[PDB]
Structures are given as structure tokens and as C-alpha cells.
Amino acid sequence: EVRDEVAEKCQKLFLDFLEEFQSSDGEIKYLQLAEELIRPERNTLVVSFVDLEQFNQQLSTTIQEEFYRVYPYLCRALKTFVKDRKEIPLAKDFYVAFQDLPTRHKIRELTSSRIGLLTRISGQVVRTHPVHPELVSGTFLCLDCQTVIRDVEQQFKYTQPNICRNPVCANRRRFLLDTNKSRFVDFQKVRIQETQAELPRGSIPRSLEVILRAEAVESAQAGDKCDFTGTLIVVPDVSKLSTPGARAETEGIRGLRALGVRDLSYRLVFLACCVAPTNPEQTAESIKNQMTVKEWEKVFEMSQDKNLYHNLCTSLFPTIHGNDEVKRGVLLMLFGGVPKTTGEGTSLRGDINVCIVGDPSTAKSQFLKHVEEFSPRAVYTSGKASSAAGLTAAVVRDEESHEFVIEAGALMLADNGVCCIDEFDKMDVRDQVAIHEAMEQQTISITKAGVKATLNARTSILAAANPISGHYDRSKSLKQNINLSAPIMSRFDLFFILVDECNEVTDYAIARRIVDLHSRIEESIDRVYSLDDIRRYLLFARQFKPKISKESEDFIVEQYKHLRQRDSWRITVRQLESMIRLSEAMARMHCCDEVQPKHVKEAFRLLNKSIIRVETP
Amino acid sequence: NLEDLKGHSVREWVSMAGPRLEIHHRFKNFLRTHVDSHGHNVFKERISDMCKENRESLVVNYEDLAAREHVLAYFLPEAPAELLQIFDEAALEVVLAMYPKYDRITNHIHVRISHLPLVEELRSLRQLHLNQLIRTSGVVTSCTGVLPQLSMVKYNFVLGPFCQSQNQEVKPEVNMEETIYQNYQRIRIQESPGKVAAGRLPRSKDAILLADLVDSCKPGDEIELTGIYHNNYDGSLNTANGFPVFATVILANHVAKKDNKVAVGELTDEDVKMITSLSKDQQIGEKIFASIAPSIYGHEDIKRGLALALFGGEPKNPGGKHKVRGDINVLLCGDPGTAKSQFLKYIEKVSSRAIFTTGQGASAVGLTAYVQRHPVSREWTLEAGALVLADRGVCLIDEFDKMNDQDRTSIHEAMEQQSISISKAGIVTSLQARCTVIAAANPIGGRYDPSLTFSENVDLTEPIISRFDILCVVRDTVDPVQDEMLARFVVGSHVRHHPSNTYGVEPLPQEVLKKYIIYAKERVHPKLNQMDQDKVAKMYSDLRKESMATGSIPITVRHIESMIRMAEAHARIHLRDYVIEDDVNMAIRVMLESFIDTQKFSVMRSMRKTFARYLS
Amino acid sequence: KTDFSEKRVELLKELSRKPDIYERLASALAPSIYEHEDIKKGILLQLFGGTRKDFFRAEINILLCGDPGTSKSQLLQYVYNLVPRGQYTSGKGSSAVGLTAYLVLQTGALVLSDNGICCIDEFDKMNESTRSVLHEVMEQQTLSIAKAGIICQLNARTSVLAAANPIESQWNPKKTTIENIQLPHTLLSR
DNA sequence: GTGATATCTGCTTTGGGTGGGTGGGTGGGTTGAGGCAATA
């Protein structure tokens, strides 16, 4: 059989690269990575193109110019490099991915001259299709002689063997496909679009079809901005091609036997071997392991700091002057309580909701923005919404299908995170009624035409509101200043007010702070802890589930009795559970395993100042 | 040794005669000898139950097979078709040994596997699961009728028998009389809405049900599906994709509704023994009342009413021309933060068929039934709403007072006549809706005013209020002793249910209660043979006199029929086949205590004095 | 196709040295419009824009409300012609070009005018959804979409030049600005 | 006498409603009237 010299040389050199390339530490970089390919779910190896370029520049150039031609041989080299380990079945297939290609091309630079070369592009995913199994090499039985033919390559069309393997056999038409000994690969089709940055001025966006295979399937989601590394190929019009096993199914080139009197056109698709984001079962021990040693000692030092509450408060909100209590409340919301389930299967809410009622231009939006920028999972939205979904689900009809579907709202998109809601007093009646269940039961229930669903809304809500008159009236109570109903107010753990103090000194402090922030953007900010440090510390601290002790039990019971005796707003069991949640969050803040009385004292201070502020002018 | 493979695949190994015979013998021995913890022959009872009901399927728990036959358990996921065929043959041999005449009822026994440990999501299925036994879960979105499929074909002289596979037309006209058929059903399974990330399109799979597996599930159901992941060449898929992609399907082996549900048939003899022994207890009523939402500090009237609603009354149709419902509807109404929503959530968790909906999230047609438009088939079709889907179940409605009035008026027919009548778009029909409605509402202004009556506190009118058999008023009063007790209970509840870990009677475990309820609703039909007509009639007249004087709530004939339902439900709780005097007395007390609670605070003392003789 | 140099930079710097460059540019901005000096100065400052701190909106938003028959549309047209990355659009829903983002993902004029100026002519004729979209763009400089399985945030760092008419046939002196044009005060405060 | 290679024969096509709505609208067909949810 004729032998492709270039591809074989590439295979040999790639095997050498895999075996010999050395990391900084002196170990073989890719031996330890290939050691992971013994698992059944893992079949792809990610190789940095810069490492390969350092090892051998001629090999890298040959791969770049003949990627489509030589890729199967690189996969064969990987198979050889993995063959030693006993756990791999002989039937397993392995694939190579290439990570860091120095140069990038635009979607409108994908011309015919790029067919078969290694390329990297960026795009916004518009649509993802279901996963399929795709045949790569078929095993067939010959019906004339019962000989078994293996490794029949497929070319965009279901192909059967051309001639029987047996020299005596002359069969050309009768074969049987055997699925159990054939080879399949995972297959996914995605449709991507030009990013808004790349879209030329006054031009309709240009779309592209990308094919993901093996591990790359289900790794990109619609709306994501992703970098794809792979190759540009042509895909013929399969509908025109006729084969012994497959009839044709209802200008281009003419003259192929499989074409009859028909024409064959082509279209360009991108065959991606690697997908990444364009801009890039937990437990305390695993969280620790994910961190480096420096980060772990920083987290421990943070846990040991005796001024942690104040340092965290100042670090999180450096641009805001004053309002220390509001910062403390928002921090406690960020740490959260311990969600629990009862013996009968019902849930006890562990999340904390906070409300901030403010005068105009009092920086409540600043609080919401700080939390939104800090939190990994956080959604910022307005009470008055642009879409029909709003803060909860909506039911909309697909015109073509006539089917009814759920459109998700803000509280659904923020599930397991934080929802910052601005202008919380402008909600509509549908959202107003649904938010009862959303805030307490943490679910949204729908029984409408074509839809019957319970949707998860396990969220912590941080809300910002305006007073009814547009200016806060100290003579009245907080309940008298806002338009929130009493049942909604009972669902909030903490309430805060921000009043415009018509004071010269406060005005002078705020003006100096703003002007200093603008004059020296970098120099103005001074955080005891960096935001990344706080993110790691919060990730570590959320793994603790402090237990309520007996003394804390007695203190909580006494405080609840006092609150009820003191008192359409009223002290309900919700205040008791809010106090429990706040105590749990206070204990969590110090990575502690038991809720001590001190945490209860602090939580009761905050909650008592919230309740009194709700009641009296 | 069976485990040792001489350079063959598992399929090849089990295909040859030696290992095939060994597997057959091992499985037969497993069926004959397997015993449970107590030592009872499991499959002797299972086969007896199968044959008494004239069924054709034997269910095998994977864990038992793995414990007793580890090699067979290992083989089963890798070569499912062959192993299942061998199991079917061995099962038929054993069954015919136990019941030698059973061959007249059926000639094939299907072995079905449950509790398969290899659970996968619909999104997670890859090419490495092809031709394996897999377990997945989802929502049934589409379901065909039961269709006849060729099994053993004969052609016209008449050609010899020919077998039919799921993937290609057989190659020899068909003789209808001499051909053999099988039941065929195709279902579409979808990701459950609570498991798909918000704003994302769900994934779906197709499944094929055969023989006695058909009609195992209905659209809208939550199902766990165990079957074979199968792929077959499809030309139009290839055309569509431009690549040689194969179509996939699940060849179903076992279908279960697995959201904590046990059927009456699945109850064993020991379970029935335990249930009967429990019913013998003198305090069983109190123990069942205490089992309703044990993590709520006492609201003893609500728990009693909810237990009665769960067990239910007895439908009657004296001469085929006068239908009376057996269901008991409940309305909770009271102050905020009193655990009304928690009660509704508990009822949803404990019931076999329950649908939970809230306030403005429910529409009129979504509750009862809706007319679906189509672009290509018949233009208009009828589809089931909440009440139809919850037929013989429970519909829970939270924020009942916040509903749109037009949407709230759509349940009137279902609450009394237990049917939904639709006359729309060429469709004139009636559907069955026999469901218990449990609703929770807040009073006008968000606080119940003791100086007023129940009718003054709520915005609901007489027609809807009369449809509720039991009315419960939840009041949040400030009392230091009660507040301390509630606080000490709630904090203890938060201590007990840390994830690391009034009646005076011990409640039943929730699993025990679920078995008890299913047995009583299925195997007990209490009969109302005798009743003190004069006492009930005199009581009804007194109640109607007082209701007209005060106007606290309307009293109608529906109040007489509710008492009879409550007496039947009380008898059902005791597993009694005939209602007795103590059931009627309990029903009277429940109705009178409810009525007194609807009065103003000043009048309450007089009302207890008026009806003291009954309340004694 | 049928529709800097060192000398050009030297000319620009020579202009920048002149004592009255502000008024010269303001006069050049819109020669046809008559006697609206302060409006022209504000529009010039909007064209230049503030400093991108990269920590702070640097964008300047201007609303021209007034009686019918003035030269508001002409000013908006002149600014639209001047700016390189600008969009001219209308608040009316029936409008051919929309403000909102809506398989092909179609971003609206606000996203298209990112790092540019969006001219909105019938500001008072916006529906509630468009008002919410505009508030989000002006407050957060982003546009969130969750539709047809697509979830994303699109950058919209755009300066709004809006034109508004009163609800009545003429401006009512007895009425303030808020009650003369039916728009929320929360939107006007941006 | 075997390997092409030229001739001959039978199948089914078309989009279509006597080929079904118990095939399916991800296999593809204007116009109007009729239920929904969100809407005002």
C-alpha cells in the first residue's frame, strides 16, 4: 500500500515530542496528563502549541500547514503513547486538542486558502444542537463469503466496503453493518455568530457552523463568547450522492458515478478540536486543595484576624462613605445561613434577604453594583422589567409551533446566587404575587396553558427601594414611607434606611471622596484584603455548617420572647428564623463550627435595630 | 469458571452454549432460593402475586441479584439483550413449575430490572453507553396509542415464520390471521423542568415500550426509565447533518414513577400485617393526626382536617342517576407566618398524585383544561389541566385570595360535579376531575380581625365558600407561654435537622404512613348502614338557625353531605368497613368546632353554650 | 465605489491654539440652526465625551424637550451625520429600526452605537418595555437578553441624544417639565 | 474460455390529498379564525 511519507514523519516526531518534552520542573509534562486518560470518560489530550513550537519548529509548521491531512496520525501517536497502561481497552479512541495558537483570524478571513490548515477564531454561540453518535470506522460482514471487513473509513456519507477483502471474493454490493464492532464518536453541531466587537460597521452578522467532537460536546452554551481552535473544511451535499448501501435522497460539479446526472455543491464548516472561553460535590478539604499554598495561608490569616468583620466591610465597599451598618448587613447576607430539610421532606430557608430604602442619590445602587461585581453568581435587575418574564417566569407562545414555553425571569437566572433588584417598589402585580413563594418557599409554580412546572429560585435578594413620596419622612415609620405590603416586609431579614443628611460636613466628605476617586483611580482605593482574597475566603467559609449550641438556644428563645412581648406589621416566627439565620452567618464569617452566644448577640443587635426602625419614626 | 473470558467479549461469551446453560441454571437457582432478611422466599410470593393477577412480568431488584449472583449482575449491563432472554426462559420454567396450567394464560414471562445503580442524566448519554443497560429519568411529553407491531410474520402457499427486529423491514402479502403481533408504544422523555438550567432548552430522548410495558406511563409523568441504549442508521439524519450520524432510542425494560411512590400491589404481606396491627391500636387516630407535618408546633385542628382530607370519603350513586362526591376540600385562612404554605408543601410531599400551584401562577384553562392549536394535523385538540391531571389526587392552591377572579371561578364545576365541561372550537366534551382541593388564603388587610366574622374577613363569596367541607382559621395571638413553647420547638427543629445529623403520642414514620394511606384508600370502602337521623337532623336545623342570625358563614345541604364524608373518612382511618357511632360523633365535633371559629369574639362564648351538648 | 497627516495635525493644533476654539467649533457644529448657542455647546461637549477612567460612565446624555416646529430633528440629524459610530432611531414601536435586541442574534441600535451616539427622535412615544431597556442601558451600560435559549450581556457604552415633545398640542407654562412630557422622573434623572 | 461492456427490463418517480391523520411536522405546502397569556 502506498505510504504517505509526510504524515508518518509527523507521527514519529509527535510521538517523540510527547515522550521527551520537559516542563519547567524537569518532569515529562504530558506523561502526567496522559496518565489521566485511563478513565472511561476521558479521551482527549490538550497540548499547548507553544510547547510544540519550542520542541520542534519544523514539526509545528508541518502540522499547521497539513493539519487535516496529518491529524489522524497524531491521534495514532497518542494511542501509541497511551498503549503501555493496561487499563485502556484496545477499542478506545483518543483525540488531540491544541490549546494556545499564537495567531487569530476573523470569521470573514475564512477563505478557501484556509481549507485544511490549523486556525483559531472567536465567536458568540447562537445555537447548540443535541449530541449524536457519529460513525468513524465501520465493521462489515460479507454476505457472499462471511468474511469480516474492518476499518472502513467514512466520508460525510454512509460508506460500505468497495471490494471484499478476500481475494477470491468479487462482491461489490452486499454487506452488513455490525454496530457492536464499529467505532463511533460523540458529535455536536453548534451555530456561532460574529461578536459585536468584530462585526464590521453597518454589516449584517455572518454566521458559521462548528462541529464539536468527543469531549468538546456540550462545552459551549448559547450566548457565550468562545475561542475555537480547529480547521476549516468543505462538506458536500450528501443528498445528491448515491452509494451501494444508500440511495440518493431528494451549480456544482458534474461527472461522478455516484452523482448520476446531478450536481454536487459544497459549503464551509469549521471542525473544532478545542473550545475555550474567550475571556476566562464541594467540601472544605477540596476547596483547600484547589488553592495554592500562598492562598491557603492567606485564607488562614484572614480567618485568624480579630478585626475581620470591619476589614471585610471596608474592603468590600471602599467608595461609599459612612453607612457601616448597611455594609455589615450586606456582608452577612453574602455569607448566608444553613439551609436544612425536615424529616418529612420540607425545606427550611437558609438564605438572607436585605432591603435598603433610600433618598435619591444616596448610593443604594452603589451597594447593589459592588455586590454584583464581587459575586461570581449574581444578577442585577430592575423591579420594572423590559421582558414579560420580569423577576419570575412568563409563558410565551412560539408562533410557528404554537407551543407555550417558559421564559425565565431574574430570580430564576440567579438561582443558587444573589439577585440585586433595583426599584423594588415598581414591581407589577404578577411579580408581586409570585415573589411571596419565591422569597419564602424558594420556588415558582406555574399551571398555565401547556405548562405545568415548579422552578427553582434558591436566591438571596438584595433590594433597593424609594419612599412613596420620593423623600423619606422621619416623622413617619418606615412602614409608612414605603409601599411594600406587610407580608412582603416580613420576608426580609433586614431593613436599612439611607437619609440625605442636609449637613455641610457630610457633603464635604462625600464630595472629597468622589473627587479623590476620579483624580487618582488606582491610588484612591486601599483594601486590607484584595477582592480575590475575599472571594477565596468566602468560598472556603461557605463550606462550614455551624451547629447551634444549648446556650445559644436559650439566648435565642429569650430574645424572641422579648421581641414578641415588646410588640399590620407584627413579630412572627419569621423573625425567629431570621435571627437563627443571622447567627449562623455570623458564626460562618469566622469559619467556626458552633454558633456561640457572641454571634447571637451581634445578630440580635442588627435585627433589633432593623425592627425598631420598622416600627417607630 | 464463568467469570474468565477466553479472549471473547461478554456478548460472545454469553452467546455460546456452555456459559448460556450455566447462566440459565444460576438464574433459576437464584429465583428458587433467594430469601430476605427475615428468611422468606421472596420470589415464591412475587410469582404467586403475578399469577393471581394474571400478569406476565416478574420484577427483579438488581441489588439482590448482585448480592447472590455477582457474575450475572456484572454481565447484565454489558450484554443486556442476551441475558434478559435467558432470564425470561428460566423464569418461564420456574413459573410453569409452580403453576403448571399457567401456559394457557401466557407463553412468555418478562424479567424486568429495578434499582439499577448506573443512573445517568438525559444530557450525559454518550457513545460509550451504546448497547448497555442504562437508567435515566425525566418527564413524559409525548405518548402514542398502543399499536400492533409484527412479531412473527407469515406471507402468502404460506411462507414460513419470520422474526421482526426494531431496526429494518423483514425480507421474504402478509397473512393477518397467521401472523403474530405485539403491543408497541413510543414515548418521548424530556428533562424535568426543575433540573434544566434556567433559560436553557431541554434535551429529549425517545423510548419504545413493548408487550405488557405499554401504558406504564402518561404524558406529564415523572418517570425513571431503565432500558437499552440503541442506535440505528438513519438516512435523513445523515442528510440533515452532512455527517454519518446514527439515530438513538431506548428499548425500555423497566418504567417506574419513582418520586417516593409505592402502589397498592407492591405492598407485601408483612406490610399489610403491620398496617392491620397498627389499626388495632386504640390511639391510632391520634397517631395519624400527629403524623401530619410533624415539624410544625401544634395547629391540631388543621392537622386533623388535613388527615381527613387525605383519607377521603366514599363516592355514592344510589340508582345511577344521582352522583355525590366523596372528596373533602379544605380552606386554610389566617395570619401571615403561620406555616400554611408549609402544610401545603407537606401535603404535596406525602401524597401519591399532588399538583401544587400558586395565586397568579394559575390560569383558568391551566387549572381545568385547555385547547391547543396545531400548524399541520387537526387544528385544535383538548389537553388536560391541573384538575384533570390530579384526578383521584390532590390539588394545592397557595395564595388563593390573590388569584384573578375569572381564574378562581373556573374551579366551581370541578369542586362539586367533579368534572370539567369544555365547548370550544368544535370540541364539546366532559372530562373527569375527582380531586381534593386544599387552598390557603390570607385575610383582607393581611391580618385576621377577631372583632369581625369569617365572611367579613375574606373577599370570597358564598358559592365558593360553601364548596369547602372544612374551614380552618389560623390565628397568631401573643401569649408568653405559647411563644416560649413555639420558640423552643422551632430552635430544636433547626438543631435536629442539621445536615450533619401535643397529642402525647408517637407519630408514625412517614414511609409507614404512606403505606397505611394507600392501603386504606384502595382496600377499605366504609359503608354507611345506620345513623342517628334525628340527632343529625336536629343539629342541622340548629346550625342553619344560628347561621342566619349571625351571618358568619352560609349553611347549605352541602354541610349535611360533608358530615357524612367526614364520618366515612374517620372510619377509613381505622380500617373499618362500616361507619359507626364514634365516626359520626367525631364528624359532628369537627363541623361544630369549625363553625364556632367563624364567629366574632364576643359571640363565641354563646355559640359554645348553644351547641355544648354535641361538643361534649 | 461611488459615494493623521503631519500637516493635518499641525493645522488641528494651530486651531487648538486659538483663544476662542470652543465658540468656533460650536458655530461650525450646526450652521443652519439659529440662535441655540448653549444647546450647540452641550452637543459639542457630548461629541467629545469625558475620560474613560476604566476603574464610571464617561458618556454625556442630553435631552432636548420643546414645542413642535422647532429645529430638534435637524440637530439630531446633524449630530448623526457627524459621528462615525452613530445611530438615528425613533422611540415609536412601529419604527423601522429598533432600540432593543431581538437563528440570528440582532442587537438593537443602542448596542450598535456602543462607543458612539444614539439619536432618539420621538422619546416621549416609547412604550414601557423600551423605557426599561433605555434605563438599563443608561444606568449599567449593558443590555441583558435571555431568549430562545440565548443568555448574554451586550456592551452598550453609548451617549443618548434624545428629542421630546409635550403631550399637549403646545408647551404648557403652568406645567413643569415632568408633567409636560410623560416620562418617569427616574429616567429623566439620568 | 473469462473479463469487461453493451443491451435489455422493471421500479418509481410527482409532491397530494381516494395514501393516512393509528406516521411525524427537525421531511415539506398564505389566509383566515380561534384560543391563550400578557396586555392596556
Add this chain to the structure above:
DNA sequence: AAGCAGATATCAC
């Protein structure tokens, strides 16, 4: 009527 799949007789070497 137009064209591909299959069957088969026929020249040539």
C-alpha cells in the same frame, strides 16, 4: 417520460 439498479447476453483477447 426520464434515469438508476439489476440482470444478462455478447464481443475480444
